[PDB]
């Protein structure tokens, strides 16, 4: 079919909320009505384009589903399906493809409501961004504000343990059941001694998380950060960023899977912040993916003042 954006008009455009914390499952929604001005055929389609600051998928990853996010059918005013929808992760564009519905009608009216999330990579810092959305070649302007919970967290002492992390991608569609997680080791960039980091596939009870952390289920890459002030708030981290120096090879025989569902990492005495990128898997029990990372250390000078900090992750799913 043909692109029929000039034949479709969106109205009553609404954004549920303009300010939120994407590190606390903050998201928003967009709702609009549309009407087909002219007659169109089955197969014809119209689109919506998100701006740089937004994504239609958030922390759900569709890279194993051809980078294409399936969307719930779009309905007429009358409750029947007018269009089947698809979201393209790469171009951040929804494509609404008219069904046979449209073949015997005129004056077709529909509406949709779709969740919207931050783009962790293009809005990596707290602040305000242009959230201008394009629907059927028309602009609907907004301002988005992200108050990210700071990744810089830890015991409040110059030599205290400090660590955080965020699950930034979960593949719930393909059946492969993968997840990507960023861990910031020592984000306060303190001088710490005998530092250990534990990446757990669960929080307090093994049976309560679908996480699966092991030598066969998990891959880790470790980066020494050069300038900590460049690090994101969104937990996005580019493994090819020149601000990151890969040291995975140095940790080759310093990562242990001595315990179930747990990756132990021996950092030792450190004075720089690290990024640990985790690619993992979760099981088929239908339990939530619930993780916890823990860093422990002592004062590098007195070998006393033991300290330990934990950080929990879990994600939520929204519907349109």
């Amino acid at each position: 079919g043909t692109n029929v954006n000039d034949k479709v008009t969106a109205s009553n455009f609404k954004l549920e909320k303009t300010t939120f914390d994407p590190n606390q499952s903050g998201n928003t929604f967009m709702a609009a009505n549309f009407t087909v001005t002219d007659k169109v055929k089955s197969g014809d389609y119209f689109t919506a384009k998100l701006p740089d600051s937004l994504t239609g998928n958030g922390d759900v990853d569709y890279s194993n589903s051809n980078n294409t996010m399936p969307i719930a059918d779009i309905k007429s005013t009358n409750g029947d399906v007018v269009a089947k929808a698809t979201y393209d992760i790469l171009t951040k564009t929804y494509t609404f493809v008219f069904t046979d519905y449209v073949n015997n009608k005129e004056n077709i009216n529909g509406q949709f409501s779709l969740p919207l999330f931050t783009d962790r990579a293009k809005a990596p810092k707290s602040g305000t961004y242009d959230a201008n959305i394009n629907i059927a070649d028309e602009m609907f302007n907004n301002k988005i504000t992200y108050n990210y919970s700071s990744p810089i967290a830890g015991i409040d002492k110059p030599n205290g343990a400090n660590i955080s992390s965020q699950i930034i991608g979960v593949d719930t569609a393909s059946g492969q059941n993968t997840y990507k997680q960023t861990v910031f080791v020592n984000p306060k960039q303190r001088v710490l001694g005998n530092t250990w980091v534990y990446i757990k596939g669960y929080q307090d009870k093994i049976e309560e998380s679908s996480g699966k952390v092991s030598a066969t289920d998990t891959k880790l890459r470790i980066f020494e950060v050069n300038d900590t002030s460049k690090l994101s708030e969104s937990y996005y981290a580019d493994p090819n960023d020149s601000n990151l120096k890969e040291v995975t090879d140095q940790f080759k025989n310093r990562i242990y899977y001595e315990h179930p569902n747990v990756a132990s990492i021996k950092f030792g005495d450190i004075t720089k912040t690290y990024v640990v990128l985790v690619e993992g898997h979760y099981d088929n029990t239908g339990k939530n993916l619930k993780t916890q990372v823990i860093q422990e250390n002592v004062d590098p000078v007195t070998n006393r003042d033991y300290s330990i900090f934990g950080w929990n992750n879990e994600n939520v799913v929204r519907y349109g």
């Binding site: 994407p22 590190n23 606390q24 499952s25 903050g26 998201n27 239609g56 998928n57 958030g58 922390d59 759900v60 990853d61 996010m69 779709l114 969740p115 999330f117 919970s149 990744p151 967290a153 830890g154 015991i155 955080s164 992390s165 965020q166 699950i167 930034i168 979960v170 937990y235 330990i308 900090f309 934990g310 950080w311 929990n312 992750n313 879990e314 994600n315 939520v316 799913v317 929204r318 519907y319 349109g320």
Partner: peptide
């Protein structure tokens, strides 16, 4: 001994 957490979301 202390801690916090964060949470994400998607569709």
């Amino acid at each position: 001994s202390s801690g916090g957490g964060s949470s994400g979301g998607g569709h």
